[PDB]
């Protein structure tokens, strides 16, 4: 149902972080 002329996603407000979640780290070897 996503039309070509639909608006792209909104930027959500984000605060400080001190976590075990690591989005910045990855492994491109996987192919992704």
């Amino acid at each position: 149902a996503a039309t070509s002329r639909d608006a792209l996603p909104n930027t959500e407000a984000s605060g400080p972080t001190h976590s075990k979640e690591i989005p910045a780290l990855t492994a491109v070897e996987t192919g992704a």
Binding site: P16, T17, H18, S19, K20, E21, I22, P23, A24, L25
Partner: protein
Amino acid sequence: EACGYSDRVLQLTLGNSTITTQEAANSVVAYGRWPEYLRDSEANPVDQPTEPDVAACRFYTLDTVSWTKESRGWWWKLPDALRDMGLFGQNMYYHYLGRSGYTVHVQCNASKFHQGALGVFAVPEMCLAGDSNTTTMHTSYQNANPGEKGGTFTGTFTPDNNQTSPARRFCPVDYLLGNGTLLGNAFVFPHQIINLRTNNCATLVLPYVNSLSIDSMVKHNNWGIAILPLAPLNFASESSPEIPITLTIAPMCCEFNGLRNITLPRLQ
């Protein structure tokens, strides 16, 4: 977590800055208190505070030092180390009063064939001893406040004998934590150990600690960071090994009162 999460792998994000680590040994929150803003019930200056938020509460990286077999130790004072750091420093010098907490992240990586252990200590009110046996409490403000550069510990107390032009500086002997108490007991202070076989880093979250709710950041340092080699650096068989130690610090929940013209200190 069965879905991969670990105490060794962390991501910290403050303002426009992110730190990653894959070899951490958890992190310490000093005295169990996370940094907070000054509450109305504990407030004292009545004027509207300046709170710079992301412009100052972000990660500043100070100059990298070098750890060798000769290294006796290093020390820094807060807020002093950060006095020239971007908009934090500017806000600090334009206001009479300021308070701040800090995330301290000490960085030191090496290899599975290196050895050594750094004790990283956060000391509230780290008053250090001076170089004189003839006069006391006489270390100059310039010498007491090295800024980003910090200072070092010595293995030997060597008294300033120039009575006519006194050096007026600290002479911090390492096993006495530069203040007359024994280093083995410094572990009652908030701390972590970078033991090279275990971790690349130390992370300490520091609350604002003082006997006042807010104070002069220019006249007074609240915290001292002391880094000392508990176990000396060693590698394979090389007589003179070296590995870098990088210090990155973020102000947290900082607010300032008493705005006026900028303070221009005599730092030399």
